[PDB]
Amino acid sequence: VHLTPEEKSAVTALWGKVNVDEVGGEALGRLLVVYPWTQRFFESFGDLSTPDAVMGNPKVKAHGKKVLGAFSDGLAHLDNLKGTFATLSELHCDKLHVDPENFRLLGNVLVCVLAHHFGKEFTPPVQAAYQKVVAGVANALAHKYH
Amino acid sequence: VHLTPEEKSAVTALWGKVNVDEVGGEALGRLLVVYPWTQRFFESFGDLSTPDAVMGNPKVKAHGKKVLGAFSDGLAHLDNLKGTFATLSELHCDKLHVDPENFRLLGNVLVCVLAHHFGKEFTPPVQAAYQKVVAGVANALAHKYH
Amino acid sequence: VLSPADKTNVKAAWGKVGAHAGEYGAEALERMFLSFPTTKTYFPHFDLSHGSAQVKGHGKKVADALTNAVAHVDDMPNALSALSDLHAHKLRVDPVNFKLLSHCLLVTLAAHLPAEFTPAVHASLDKFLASVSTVLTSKYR
Amino acid sequence: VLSPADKTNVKAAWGKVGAHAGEYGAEALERMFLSFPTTKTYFPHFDLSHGSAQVKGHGKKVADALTNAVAHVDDMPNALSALSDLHAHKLRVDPVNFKLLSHCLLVTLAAHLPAEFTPAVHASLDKFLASVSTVLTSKYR
Ligand code: HEM
Ligand code: HEM
């Protein structure tokens, strides 16, 4: 997407400090908790009945890790989010039947998780660089839908 | 905008049958009537107190045909809507302070107006090509917002 | 907030679709699927192709539900309750699709009720489909 | 509709903002103007530069309004009817923008009440901002 380099840099530096393993589990669990209809896709995941059932479900914690590594790869190919994500775009569509609006909810929840973790360190400006990225990743994922 | 030349041909054919005088007055008219808060921008046309007051105003009318003609112009440039509307984009941002979200509203109203008019001829397939167009123009108009 | 003119507006356009409600239903669905391909994510089990007997049946059901909302405009909450239940707890359709369908039914009506598809009746049906939407997404969370 | 549980969560989180509500409302506005510049179309008369007194000045008022909806959680429509009228007939702010400022207030709370910004509290506060935005845009047409 059209990040500016001081934008690319500020995103990059922060991403530097993220624990992907724990942060993926968190954004994924928070999605399932604030937008409960999104649980329609994770029924084989067991108990999603309460916030703790969701938040410590090892199945959610482990999927969260897969989603964030994929995300991670994305941040390395910021010039080419579309091809980066095209086989994942086709998977979510044709086999998963995932409405792309879910990609947008997730990005919003993730920004919430960056702020919750970095505090003051997640500034308005850093927030604006990340809003751009999540939008760039949601679009790349929605790209192969037909 | 990723239109098919078959979609480009269906858009093009329909558009050549369009009474711009009648369709622009009608599209601008119903925007002010369906979404009454878009009237804060046209305060100066004057009396916009009713469908009929609105629909009747020759300012509304002269201004709808003016808008429909910038639209025509971009249908002649489907290839570069952004380059075609950069200045129009900058004026609406820097001069008129219009939320681009209103661009979106106007494209949907246009689509109801082309349907209203072509009845039977405005098929799902033609509606679909026109949805893309209106989305493209909205985005191109949104482009120089800062 | 449906005003008495709005309610009138709506009872007259809709009384006119009359025996065609079902075809307008199937028609609004086909325009949605073509114009907004993401909405097809919800009907993975349907034959979505043109003239589908599946899309047909479905149009009727949607149109039947509108008809009954029309006739209970006054208590849409209670009248559409089984359905916000269904949508909220079983189907779990993201709220943003409600606007896409709404638009598509607005466009089917314009194309079919040239004479009644007046600006004031246009503003009314729009407000109408918008409160049906709200009622149907009221128990999501 | 806000459950008891929601109401409890919101009083409790709003509870710790306390004396920073205004400083948090200023900060939320700033996040908003910077992550979605289109919202700036409504503040063409304001100085939107960092530290702008105008901005601090407005964040306080917005903060105050929220504090009062929390204060009357059980009557939000009546506690806020006046600001709905404002937004509806005087200001005429497209509804989409209520969603952007709700998000930026969540982000601000998250950045400052990490201890309390829990998944249930987060679900609670989201439903509350959603329900405040719904009151503010109820009188549009
Ligand atoms: C940042 C956006 C996302 C990324 C990068 C992402 C990445 C991935 C990856 C890498 C996989 C595994 C692919 C495979 O099994 O071969 C996957 C699977 C899946 N994704 Fe996503 N995903 C994203 C968003 C979402 C959202 C928001 C939802 C629904 C709310 C979703 C629904 C699914 C489902 C249901 C699966 C398969 C789970 C299972 O194994 O049973 N995805 N995703
Ligand atoms: C849908 C795409 C749109 C196009 C192609 C467009 C095009 C135009 C054109 C061609 C003009 C004349 C500019 C000039 O003569 O200097 C203009 C002016 C203007 N436009 Fe738009 N416009 C669009 C949407 C909108 C919408 C939806 C609104 C508001 C709800 C809006 C608000 C205005 C205003 C307030 C002016 C100033 C006109 C006057 O006072 O005479 N525009 N636009």
Ligand code: HEM
């Ligand atoms: C105007 C708003 C809507 C109305 C009045 C409506 C009405 C209905 C009705 C009457 C049924 C059938 C229930 C039955 O046989 O028990 C149904 C089912 C269904 N609806 Fe909706 N609906 C609306 C919006 C939506 C939207 C926007 C979507 C997705 C884009 C959606 C997706 C579904 C699905 C997936 C089913 C299940 C269909 C089947 O499997 O047979 N609905 N709806």
Ligand code: HEM
């Ligand atoms: C949902 C949360 C919101 C709250 C609680 C809120 C509250 C307020 C308050 C308390 C005021 C000052 C009115 C007065 O002086 O009595 C106000 C004015 C205003 N609001 Fe909001 N508002 C909200 C959403 C929005 C949004 C989303 C926008 C636009 C992006 C907006 C734009 C404005 C503007 C332009 C003014 C007048 C500013 C001025 O002229 O000084 N509001 N609002």
